[PDB]
Scaffold this active site. Sequence first.
Site, PDB file in Angstrom:
ATOM      1  CG  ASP A 293      -2.354   0.546   0.834  1.00 12.37           C
ATOM      2  OD1 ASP A 293      -2.458   1.777   0.606  1.00 12.37           O
ATOM      3  OD2 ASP A 293      -3.309  -0.238   0.795  1.00 12.37           O
TER       4      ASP A 293
ATOM      5  CE  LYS B 210      -0.554   7.811  -6.348  1.00 16.69           C
ATOM      6  NZ  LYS B 210      -0.746   6.556  -5.583  1.00 16.69           N
TER       7      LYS B 210
ATOM      8  CB  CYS C  72     -14.614   1.257   1.352  1.00 22.49           C
ATOM      9  SG  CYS C  72     -16.272   0.980   2.044  1.00 22.49           S
TER      10      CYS C  72
ATOM     11  CB  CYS D 225     -18.638   2.786   2.399  1.00 23.89           C
ATOM     12  SG  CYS D 225     -17.703   2.085   1.005  1.00 23.89           S
ATOM     13  CB  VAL D 226     -15.741   3.277   7.002  1.00 23.07           C
ATOM     14  CG1 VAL D 226     -15.653   3.433   8.509  1.00 23.07           C
ATOM     15  CG2 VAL D 226     -15.656   1.798   6.627  1.00 23.07           C
ATOM     16  N   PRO D 227     -16.409   6.356   6.751  1.00 22.08           N
ATOM     17  CG  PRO D 227     -14.940   7.831   5.644  1.00 22.08           C
ATOM     18  CD  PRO D 227     -15.230   6.350   5.881  1.00 22.08           C
ATOM     19  CE  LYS D 228     -22.039   6.777   2.489  1.00 24.68           C
ATOM     20  NZ  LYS D 228     -22.221   5.832   1.357  1.00 24.68           N
TER      21      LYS D 228
ATOM     22  CB  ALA E 119       4.375  -1.708  -6.048  1.00 26.75           C
TER      23      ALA E 119
ATOM     24  CE1 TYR F  46     -20.245   6.272  -6.216  1.00 29.93           C
ATOM     25  CE2 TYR F  46     -21.096   5.599  -4.102  1.00 29.93           C
ATOM     26  CZ  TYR F  46     -20.072   5.582  -5.030  1.00 29.93           C
ATOM     27  OH  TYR F  46     -18.894   4.916  -4.782  1.00 29.93           O
TER      28      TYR F  46
ATOM     29  CD  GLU G 152     -23.657   8.174  -0.992  1.00 30.14           C
ATOM     30  OE1 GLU G 152     -22.457   8.315  -0.844  1.00 30.14           O
ATOM     31  OE2 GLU G 152     -24.179   7.080  -1.138  1.00 30.14           O
TER      32      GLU G 152
ATOM     33  CD  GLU H 107     -15.273   3.672 -10.534  1.00 35.62           C
ATOM     34  OE1 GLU H 107     -14.700   4.170  -9.510  1.00 35.62           O
ATOM     35  OE2 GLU H 107     -14.913   3.917 -11.710  1.00 35.62           O
ATOM     36  CG  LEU H 108     -20.656  -1.011  -6.321  1.00 38.82           C
ATOM     37  CD1 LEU H 108     -21.838  -1.972  -6.410  1.00 38.82           C
ATOM     38  CD2 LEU H 108     -21.084   0.229  -5.544  1.00 38.82           C
TER      39      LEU H 108
ATOM     40  CG  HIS I 106     -48.428  -4.191  10.222  1.00 38.96           C
ATOM     41  ND1 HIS I 106     -48.415  -3.061   9.439  1.00 38.96           N
ATOM     42  CD2 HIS I 106     -49.217  -3.919  11.281  1.00 38.96           C
ATOM     43  CE1 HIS I 106     -49.214  -2.151   9.969  1.00 38.96           C
ATOM     44  NE2 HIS I 106     -49.716  -2.658  11.102  1.00 38.96           N
TER      45      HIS I 106
ATOM     46  CD  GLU J 210     -46.851  -4.114   6.309  1.00 37.36           C
ATOM     47  OE1 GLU J 210     -47.762  -5.027   6.300  1.00 37.36           O
ATOM     48  OE2 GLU J 210     -46.611  -3.368   7.314  1.00 37.36           O
TER      49      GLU J 210
END
Lengths: 495, 496
Positions: free
Chosen positions: B32, B35, B49, B54-57, B121, B189, B193, B319-320, B464, B469
């Site tokens: 890893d 930059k 993420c 995704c985590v902080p958001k 690398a 997105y 968001e 992109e997921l 319910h 439902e």
Amino acid sequence: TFMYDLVVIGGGSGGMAAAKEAAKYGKKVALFDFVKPSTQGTKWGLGGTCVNVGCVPKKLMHYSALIASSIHHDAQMSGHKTSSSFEWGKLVETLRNHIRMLNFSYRTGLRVGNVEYINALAKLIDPHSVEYEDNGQKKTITSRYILLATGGRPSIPETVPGAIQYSITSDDIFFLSKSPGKTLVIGASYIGLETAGFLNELGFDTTVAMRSIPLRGFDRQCSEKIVEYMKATGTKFLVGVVPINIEKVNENIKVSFSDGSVEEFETVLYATGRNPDVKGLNLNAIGVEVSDSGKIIAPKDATSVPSIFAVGDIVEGRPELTPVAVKAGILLARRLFAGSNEFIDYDFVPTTVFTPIEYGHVGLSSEAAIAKYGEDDIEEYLSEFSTLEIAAAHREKPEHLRENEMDFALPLNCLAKLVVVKSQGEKVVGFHFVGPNAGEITQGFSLAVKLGATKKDFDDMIGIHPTDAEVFGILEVTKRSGESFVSSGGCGGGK
Amino acid sequence: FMYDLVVIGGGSGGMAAAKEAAKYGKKVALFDFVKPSTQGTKWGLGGTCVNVGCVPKKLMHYSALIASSIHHDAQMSGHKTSSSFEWGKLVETLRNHIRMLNFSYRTGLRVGNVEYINALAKLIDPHSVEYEDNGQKKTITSRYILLATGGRPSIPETVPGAIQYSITSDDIFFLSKSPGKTLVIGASYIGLETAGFLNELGFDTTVAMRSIPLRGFDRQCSEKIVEYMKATGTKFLVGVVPINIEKVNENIKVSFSDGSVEEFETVLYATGRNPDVKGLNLNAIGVEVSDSGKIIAPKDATSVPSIFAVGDIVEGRPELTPVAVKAGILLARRLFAGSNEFIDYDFVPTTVFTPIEYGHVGLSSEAAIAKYGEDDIEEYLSEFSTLEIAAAHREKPEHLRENEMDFALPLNCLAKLVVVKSQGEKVVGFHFVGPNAGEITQGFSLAVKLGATKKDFDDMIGIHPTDAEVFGILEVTKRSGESFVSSGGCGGGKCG
Ligand SMILES: Cc1cc2nc3c(=O)[nH]c(=O)nc-3n(C[C@H](O)[C@H](O)[C@H](O)COP(=O)(O)OP(=O)(O)OC[C@H]3O[C@@H](n4cnc5c(N)ncnc54)[C@H](O)[C@@H]3O)c2cc1C
Ligand SMILES: Cc1cc2nc3c(=O)[nH]c(=O)nc-3n(C[C@H](O)[C@H](O)[C@H](O)COP(=O)(O)OP(=O)(O)OC[C@H]3O[C@@H](n4cnc5c(N)ncnc54)[C@H](O)[C@@H]3O)c2cc1C
């Protein structure tokens, strides 16, 4: 050769559904609905038990709990600094105003769907006739078919003295003009647990009296986590101990016990069970065969009198749940009038308990699946873990329950579990989730199960991240493997 | 071959391949290095993420979700509440939990027996790679190599004063400073968001949209999201991008394509991301890269067959996170533990965490109308409000009232099934706008994938009171032309 095609005695979920669906076919419908006052004098309008003294008010009470938690645990951690005081009386006002909306709302829906509502008690007169009161003058009408749909009401035990005179029920608790204060709930049924759930979360000294085990019938592991969570959050639990006496000591209620202990409460609530409200119907004389349990016998929604049907809380060997009423009620109105012979697949009825942590599921408890298939064709894949947002909050126990110095953390708020069958390629027979939004999570997965999902299909499922639901894509640990199914790592139910 | 497998990228895809490959006694290196972002932000292991995704958001979104209930709900449920907000504390909660995860992850690699090295690398040939150690360049050799270096934000270099000033999604969670008045450029997105939680958290939030919101996704569902955000004090400049950005004292003045001008204490480019592949030295090795910069490897295998790719860098895949992960795991299986499995990319759920969350799997109404035509296509849907919020009577801020019954925020929920007349109404589209979308969408993604039909859905027994439902009682249709608004407002489902 009868005045009507269909009469319905009960303005409940089941009741109003059959009526409106039956009416969608130009068929002529009467509907009776009158609210016998509670044992504490409480009474209300149209919609039945779910609108008035059931699922509707319940959820608004749970919501106002769920809010109060975040406020107390979360609000500051998310950078929101807060004062907040709570007034029972206003929460009530919000309930009664919204419920009133629905009572009215519903009257209209019957009129507009062309159904003759009458606010009055009915009483079966014979296979095709019923009797009510009109101005206090008893009139009689006749039908091709009749639907019994009368719901139940709470059972307060008559052998415990000072119960009936004092104790409240589910029918009274949403609408007390008076904050119930230090409160004994007698019941570890879904109701009791739920009701002792929001009183606590809303900051009232809440004790629960459990004669034996919590939520008899549901999966043991999942019920044992719920109780463990509720102890941790300031609900107290007298197991093996029921009341044997209840009396008024000044403006408090002193409550002697089966073990030989005593305690004072400002309000007491019997959540012990329910009896079908069928006593005024005059059944046996007509020939309606009713079980040892008072519940009516009609497992295809059809009684001993074949011009007569039944649905909901009152019929034997079915769950007491609103949508189970409705599907059966809709179908019955289809089968009769619109050339259908569909019946509910009872093997697949989801449900969710809205305890301070919600528990949803479909199919068999680990226990029930161990019986039917034996502990050799049975594999229990699970993962117990914290939902990301709550992991960040570092939710803590209240001080008075601290035992040591790194004792601060509540239990992990989630547990996911699938029970599946070795000999049917690990076919999924049990789906269970303890957490927030369990029902919202349980629903989609109920249908995958009912479409015959395997563990194979589950692990090929691609996740939505972040969610608690994605944990189901990556369950690998097993009961049989014996090793740790805990996941402190705040990555969640997926990466 | 010094190694069986080297991985350049500690992202979702990256770490998954590594640890699955390692579950087979196979020797694994993993690189890893972060930059620093165009505005000098930097962080630890886990990828986009964990760190700036995704985590902080979600924690930031949750802290927004909370702020609403406080302002709309608290009181009606009988909780009277004073509340002021501290940006700096929300940050602290993020940093501290993400730090936990950075560490948390290092350990998972060590314990799953994987050699993590923190440094850049650079491919030297089909089986060799070069990094720096003490500032001295060392070189190792592998049987297979996995590229998955992720992408980074695209700030356009044509618009002057952008790079020098504008921030990105890699800065926003950790700003040492509350951003105040914020322009977001992009209704992707991310932009939607991010302009979602800044607004919910009470910062003057404008969105600058070149054309349409959430290009790609279902139009009706995206149009409700924008409509909901206008209703809640997000502003929207259509058909207008920035053409100039300059520092007017301690503010940022932002000239526009139509002519107009505006000052912000913040600008944020959510216009897209480009694969971080330029330092890899690809083409010299012989890695065929698309017109789009993304690498070409649709079976996770490049032009150099000793070389693979996964996640945001490979072309024609969503992109997921989870698509990265399963692809990364599988490739580690396929190679080393005799496996033939690939991702079914026909069934990848997703959820946009806007002030109302939107989840879905399969085809937008539009995409299903194309593939199957306006005859074999039936659109069953319902607009309604979740019962809790129905009781709260959430109302608009005053400045957006135009008349006397103009109080309403829009219904928060829209459910839709898209199905195929000529395959017994087989379900090809599942779409849900509301709270706990994702929580709802996931279960339903798999049922759809197993070949749910409208009949299976209508025979579904309900829980319910839930919003989910509603999927057991959708009867109205787009084609029937009737009102799809709630008969009452009794949750998502009817009590009879
Ligand atoms: C606290 C609580 C929480 C619940 N939560 C949920 C939940 O979350 N989800 C869920 O699905 N279910 C829930 N339920 C259960 C739900 O209330 C019942 O399943 C449902 O109300 C049963 O409907 P029904 O048609 O059988 O009649 P009910 O809904 O029980 O209503 C019965 C009606 O019959 C009428 N009636 C009775 N006798 C006569 C007569 N002689 N003449 C005329 N009218 C008559 C009464 O006016 C009454 O309104 C809950 C119940 C309670 C008590
Ligand atoms: C704000 C935001 C929100 C998102 N939300 C969601 C969401 O809610 N749901 C969802 O499913 N997806 C979401 N995503 C997408 C998701 O983050 C990515 O699709 C996924 O994380 C990509 O993983 P990856 O392994 O391809 O790259 P990354 O996860 O970015 O990891 C690649 C790693 O390689 C490192 N690296 C780069 N060059 C080198 C080098 N030369 N040597 C070593 N390491 C190097 C990078 O610094 C990085 O750490 C979101 C993205 C963003 C930006």
